[PDB]
């Protein structure tokens, strides 16, 4: 069902996150976290403190698609060095690691990026909530996942 995710997502915050390889975005599928550049990691932190959730919509640059999405669980911090494909580093959860074509999202626009669609965006910009949400409702669910365990954390 959908009920635990709309609970998750319940007043939450949401940014585009940009990865210039599917390499990056595998290795933050695995090991459970993220890295930014500075500016990006200062409203991260900051989000995370003003919000119950801060969701993470994952983009790889050429690929036509999002490839999932995150819950952040901690602001960063500075831990065993992660091998990316070139500041801190946030711990994340994922709700959805599968895939959503950006064909699927066309009637979702951005008020926060001029109204653009919301797969238009530089890394780190954030998505309004109704078109957050909506964007994350749309992804196929991920059986793999449960809930409850991401649930406990707010």
Same mark, same amino acid.
């Given at each position: 069902?959908?009920?635990? +995710? ?5 007043? #939450? $915050? ?7 390889? *599917?390499?990056?975005?595998? !290795? #933050? ?8 550049? =500075?500016?990006? @990691?200062?409203?991260?932190?900051? #989000?995370? $403190? %003003? #919000?119950?959730?801060?969701? +993470? ?8 698609? /999002?490839?999932?999405?995150?819950? !952040?669980? %901690?602001?960063?911090? *500075? ?6 494909? !070139? ?9 959805? $690691?599968?895939?959503? =074509?950006?064909?699927?999202?066309? *009637? ?6 001029? *109204? ?5 965006? $530089?890394?780190?910009? @954030?998505? @309004? ?9 749309? /992804?196929? =669910? ?13």
């Amino acid at each position: 069902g959908t009920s635990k +995710l709309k609970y998750v997502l319940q007043d #939450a $915050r949401f940014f585009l996150i940009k990865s210039n390889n *599917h390499e990056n975005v595998s !290795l #933050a599928k695995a090991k459970g976290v993220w890295s930014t550049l =500075p500016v990006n @990691e200062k409203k991260l932190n900051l #989000a995370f $403190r %003003s #919000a119950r959730s801060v969701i +993470l919509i994952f983009s790889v640059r050429e690929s036509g698609k /999002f490839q999932g999405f995150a819950r !952040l669980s %901690s602001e960063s911090h *500075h831990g065993s060095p992660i091998h990316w494909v !070139l500041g801190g580093v946030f711990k994340i959860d994922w709700i959805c $690691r599968r895939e959503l =074509p950006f064909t699927k999202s066309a *009637h979702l626009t951005n008020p926060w990026n001029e *109204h653009k669609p919301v797969k238009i965006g $530089r890394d780190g910009q @954030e998505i @309004e909530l109704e078109c957050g949400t909506q964007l994350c409702l749309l /992804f196929p =669910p991920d059986e793999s996942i449960d809930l409850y365990q991401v649930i406990h954390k707010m």
